[PDB]
Amino acid sequence: VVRDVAIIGLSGRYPQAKNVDEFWNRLKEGKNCISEIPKDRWDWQSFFDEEKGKKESMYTKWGGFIDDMDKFDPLFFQISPKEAEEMDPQERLFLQEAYASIEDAGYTPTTLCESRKVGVFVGVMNGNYPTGATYWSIANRLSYLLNFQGPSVAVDTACSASLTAIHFALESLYSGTSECAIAGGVNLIVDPVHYMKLSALTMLSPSNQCKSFGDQADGFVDGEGVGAIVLKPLDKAIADGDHIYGVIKGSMMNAGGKTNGYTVPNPQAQAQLVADALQRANVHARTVSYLEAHGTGTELGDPIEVAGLTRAFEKDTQDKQFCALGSAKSNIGHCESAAGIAGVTKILLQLKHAQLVPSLHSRTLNPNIDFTKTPFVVQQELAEWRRPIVEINGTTNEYPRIAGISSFGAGGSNAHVIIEEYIPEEQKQSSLKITPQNPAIFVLSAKNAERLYEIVQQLLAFIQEHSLSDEHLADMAYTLQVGRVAMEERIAVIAGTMKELQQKLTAYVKGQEHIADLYRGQVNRNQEMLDILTSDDELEETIARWMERGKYSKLLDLWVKGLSIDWNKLYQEEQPGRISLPTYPFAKESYWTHA
Amino acid sequence: SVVRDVAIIGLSGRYPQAKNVDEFWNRLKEGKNCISEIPKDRWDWQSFFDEEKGKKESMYTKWGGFIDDMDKFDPLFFQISPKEAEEMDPQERLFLQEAYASIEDAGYTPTTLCESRKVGVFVGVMNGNYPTGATYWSIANRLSYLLNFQGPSVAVDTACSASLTAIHFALESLYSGTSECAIAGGVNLIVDPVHYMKLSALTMLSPSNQCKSFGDQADGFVDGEGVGAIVLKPLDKAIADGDHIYGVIKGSMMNAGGKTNGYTVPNPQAQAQLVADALQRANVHARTVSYLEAHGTGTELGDPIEVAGLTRAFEKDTQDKQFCALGSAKSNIGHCESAAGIAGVTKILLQLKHAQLVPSLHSRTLNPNIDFTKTPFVVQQELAEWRRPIVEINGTTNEYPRIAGISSFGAGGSNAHVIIEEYIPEEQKQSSLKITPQNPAIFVLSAKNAERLYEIVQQLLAFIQEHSLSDEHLADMAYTLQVGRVAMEERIAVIAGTMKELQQKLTAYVKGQEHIADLYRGQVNRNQEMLDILTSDDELEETIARWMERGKYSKLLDLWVKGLSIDWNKLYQEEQPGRISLPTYPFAKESYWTHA
């Protein structure tokens, strides 16, 4: 039966946004990330022809392109350089983003699920790499390297592949086939044929603007993207103390069927799909305050889109101009398979910051659409997200910030998902208060010294722009203790306040060779030493005694050498909460194949 | 929702040296090897042929399972321009044709398949080497669009288990209520030498022409082509509708191997857990299983791990040995990858229908590394009737139906399993629809043009011959041809009270006979305004009802042949006949290809 499913992790790469934070900054500023075709992909002048519909040519020079496309760190995953050269960049990027999402969740593959029943569902539709289309490997490699014994399937459903993958993951969680799932999508542009095919049958706009729900709409703009989320039942997530971005209440998907031409959308199917999604989620349409439409900026698509949603909403309520409307495609373009995950990321960011971002190019609305006759009001300027107050069935009540996203493929496949915010219960005992009398333990590890240096710099910045304070010390320590893999190069710090942590990390960044309560070491040099020290049960008794009695200094002195420690026993009573911190700074090396 | 029985009501597929299921059964029964040389229309093998194994930009093989009429299509049937069909992937074309054939075999038409039109489509595919790019979603989206299916339409890529995973997803959708019917299947085609070059580079393909499953000297598998589909539907509803059921699916499960001592290395523990969970869901005791369609790729590493995993799974429940059969169709048709699961399902269904176990080729010399005496399985070697196992589960003798299972494992670690059980009809054979000269049947055949109708007549005559159909099948045949076939332009009808009379009249039609008793010809293209004026009157409806009830079949056919639309359901006021399998539409064969 249907039940609440929680989102506990998030990560993605989008045009002019190497992470979610930069993506939020771009959305907040109303920035257009559409740019020219980079020269490293191919030269556009040779293939550029203004005539529309011509074969073996394109009439566009813009698109959403992500930086560091061919960058990988194979040694992290124990992969030879030649293999990585033969691997599809989509597989590499999805692997990195999935690892980053698991890190953001405050979880490691060993502790993600003891049963190891973790599902993997990736949506992808383009395989233009010169070594052939191998979609299954994208998920199989992730399941193999991280040792996931659950479902690992790649889904191809056109522009709604990611959303359909999320739906399948939800179904697997409901059926008990899995306890956790990695759901996401990826879309990369690596061959001019990608643009040639689209230009031949004329869906791409000639300009650099995907004018969603605007006048003069003449198609969408291609873009690249990749992202993933970690799904988990709400009750279990609440018990574990992990942070929840949002809650998924329902999902549905169908096909348009027979229309007046292949690829022509069907409003009736969309209306039925949205109605069924609300039915499953048990959500009244009047309570929805935002809606992430497909919004490809197509003359034909947009009116049909709005009409379908209008009918679905009119099935329940007759009010008008009470819901918002927008799309991230106006910012980052149409990334196809990753469009659904990008919209989900936008919704989660809006919920976190409780704000509605502008929708570009909607200043002049489509004359063919009469929004006054519709519940929707296209967002135009940054505004705080109010909780809707409604009069459902003669009873006033304040409802949480609810949102929905609809993704529709070119082949008629359609999907929809309902997302609701999480309202934590007022349980803030804060018995884990960090003070100089109860100093915290901060541990950072990396494969080599350079990666650790970048980790330190990234953490310092993250503290700066997020304005973290002393109340986050316990959460930070717990996340860095039982949320990060313990690697070769290792260091630790003891701090009773945030400013002290700032000072010591800053000293480490500079060429300071001795710092108070700071330790350095490596595990490669210590195998037999760790073996002899671990041979004794005195090790276990000693570590327990020297944790309980307050001997943190020596505990770190040994942990840095290579000693393995279960930090859970350090918190006998209650448990801190995981939070989001910068992920591992994967090395950037160029690997490519010759056609 | 909760697990429940799901029935199979349709089947169709194309396999090497087998254009349909009947020829596939004939090949399996004869113990035939369908592996042959590479056809010259695909590419020349001598240029790329190098004996050295693992060499780049070359292959060390010249054999594979190839299906005939690969580039043949009938676009005008589906209202498709020739250029579009040229641009369409052959996998999409073949899957579309096979899905239509399966729906026809079910005794169903797209209009009447489901009134709600919630029909799911799940296709497993992993190779997209066509020169126009890999477009997998279109394979299912085109089928949903042409036939107007408003349910899920998704393409699945899970390596060698894509078809089985698609079947699992369709079952889950049926359980959740997202759909009432589903088209599940897979397809795998070889159209580019890169397909063989990649496999030869990392050395999985055997150099010989034999996929020696569970045999000595095993050194890999042999590539093959295949395509097939099935129609799924809840058992209770299918029983109510009277449709024929090939078998019943009790459970399905799928997982991944995880971390092993190398990428693509199988994990026995994951396979054992998968099989155990599948039996758990199906509520089937392992001792009751009498057949098992293993993956059986004929690999030195794979086979012992395969047998060990199944051995552990079975030992979880029972400790008996040498009581279950074992085999694979890959020894016959090779390893078709995405279509391997559907091919094995088809083999199991055919075995259940004919209640026989077919030989497993190249298993005469068993693998020395495997001690089958320590295992429940006994590899089948010769054709034998399928006994119902009599077992002593928990101190109670009972005779159980013929149960079977099939396991498909991908190269990336993905695994799948399905349990199939036979259907035992209840003894309800009132036969109140007996066909006699006093109650003659109505036989109607329609086609786009005259040639297709001619081939339909010939195919039906043959089908009667080799299946030895008799008078007791007349009602089922008439019902299937009435409410199971689309009513097309070229149309004819016949009135017959016995099978021999039908044979005589159809044979006369085949020959150049211009007048035959109780035989009518006509077309619908010439009759639009005539049908409009005749249908303008409610006298039409009253008249057709009167002239059905009162026995005026001759005039009813005289008008039906012209273009009149008739609902044959009212012709059977009491009870309802049962649908059966009859030859499908003979799609025209025209060559369409693209230039790279």
* Per-position DSSP letters for A393-429, written without gaps between them: GG--EE---EEEEEEE-TTSEEEEEEEE-----S---
Contact B150 A269 (CB under 8 A): yes
Of A149, A171, A258, the CB nearest to B258: A149
Of B129, B149, B413, the CB nearest to A144: B413
Instruction: Give the largest Cα separation in chain B, rounded.
Output: 80
Within A202-266, residue ranges assigned H as helices are: 234-240
Contact A143 B253 (CB under 8 A): no
Instruction: Give the largest Cα separation in chain A, rounded.
Output: 80
For helices A528-535 and A537-548, give the axis angle rounded to 10 degrees: 80
Secondary structure of B492-535 in HEC code, one letter for each residue: EEEEECCHHHHHHHHHHHHCCCCCCCCEEEECCCCCCHHHHHHH
d(CA B203, CA B52): 10
Nearest CA among B520, B448, B518 for reference residue B486:
B448
Rounded to the nearest angstrom, the minimum Cα separation between A594 and chain B is 13
Q: Which two tokens stand for residue A581?
A: 């911190």
Contact A151 B253 (CB under 8 A): no
- B147: chain A residues, CB-CB within 8 Å: 258
Residue B386: how many other CB atoms lie within 10 Å: 17
Q: Are B324 and B357 in contact (CB under 8 A)?
A: no
Q: Which chain A residue is nearest to residue B194, measuring alpha carbons? A: A132
Residues in chain B: 596
Which fold is adopted by the domain A5-420? Peroxisomal Thiolase; Chain A, domain 1 (3.40.47)
Q: From the candidates A3, A129, A254, A593, which should be mutated to test the interface with B, based on the most B CB atoms within 10 A? A: A254
Rounded to the nearest angstrom, the minimum Cα separation between B67 and chain A is 23
User: Residue written as tokens 């194994």?
Assistant: B53
Q: Are B9 and B243 in contact (CB under 8 A)?
A: yes
Residue B459: how many other CB atoms lie within 10 Å: 15
Resolution in A: 2.9
Contact B145 A412 (CB under 8 A): yes
Q: Which two tokens stand for residue A323?
A: 């819901």
Q: Are A517 and A504 in contact (CB under 8 A)?
A: yes
Contact A150 B259 (CB under 8 A): no
Q: Are A133 and B116 in contact (CB under 8 A)?
A: no
Q: Which chain B residue is nearest to residue A264, measuring alpha carbons? A: B145
Rounded to the nearest angstrom, the minimum Cα separation between B541 and chain A is 30
Of B138, B150, B410, the CB nearest to A411: B138
Give me the DSSP letters along A105-140.
TT--HHHH-TT--EEEEEE-----STT----HHHHH
* A273 Cα distance to chain centroid: 25
Q: Are A407 and A157 in contact (CB under 8 A)?
A: no
Residue A184: how many other CB atoms lie within 10 Å: 34
Bridge partners for B357 per DSSP: B384
Contact B259 A145 (CB under 8 A): yes
Q: Which CATH architecture has domain B6-421?
A: 3-Layer(aba) Sandwich (3.40)
Contact B136 A143 (CB under 8 A): no
Rounded to the nearest angstrom, the minimum Cα separation between A429 and chain B is 40
What are φ and ψ of residue B462, in 5° steps?
A: -60, -50
d(CA B181, CA B171): 10
Q: Which two tokens stand for residue A435?
A: 């003070």
Rounded to the nearest angstrom, the minimum Cα separation between A200 and chain B is 13
Contact A149 B414 (CB under 8 A): no
d(CA B226, CA B335): 9
Q: From the candidates A2, A78, A85, A135, which should be mutated to test the interface with B, based on the most B CB atoms within 10 A? A: A135
d(CA A377, CA A356): 12
Q: Are B103 and B143 in contact (CB under 8 A)?
A: no
Contact B137 A157 (CB under 8 A): yes
Residue A144: how many other CB atoms lie within 10 Å: 24
- B179: chain A residues, CB-CB within 8 Å: none
Nearest CA among B8, B575, B476 for reference residue B235:
B8
- A141: chain B residues, CB-CB within 8 Å: 263, 412
Q: Which two tokens stand for residue B233?
A: 């539907």
Residue B488: how many other CB atoms lie within 10 Å: 17
Contact B263 A144 (CB under 8 A): yes
Q: Which chain B residue is nearest to residue A150, measuring alpha carbons? A: B255
Contact A262 B142 (CB under 8 A): yes
Bridge partners for A228 per DSSP: A11, A184
Query: One-letter amino acid identity for B121?
Result: V
Q: Which two tokens stand for residue A191?
A: 């061959």
What are φ and ψ of residue A118, in 5° steps?
A: -115, 120
d(CA A455, CA A461): 10
Nearest CA among A248, A119, A279 for reference residue B176:
A279
Contact A256 B150 (CB under 8 A): yes
Contact A143 B1 (CB under 8 A): no
Query: One-letter amino acid identity for B427?
Result: E
d(CA B419, CA B281): 10
Q: Are B293 and B347 in contact (CB under 8 A)?
A: yes
Q: Are A121 and A153 in contact (CB under 8 A)?
A: yes
User: Residue written as tokens 């992290």?
Assistant: A76
What are φ and ψ of residue A547, in 5° steps?
A: -85, -50
Over the range B533-554, which residues count as b (16 or more CB within 10 Å of their CB) and which as e?
ebeeeeebeebbeeebeeeebe
Residues in chain A: 595
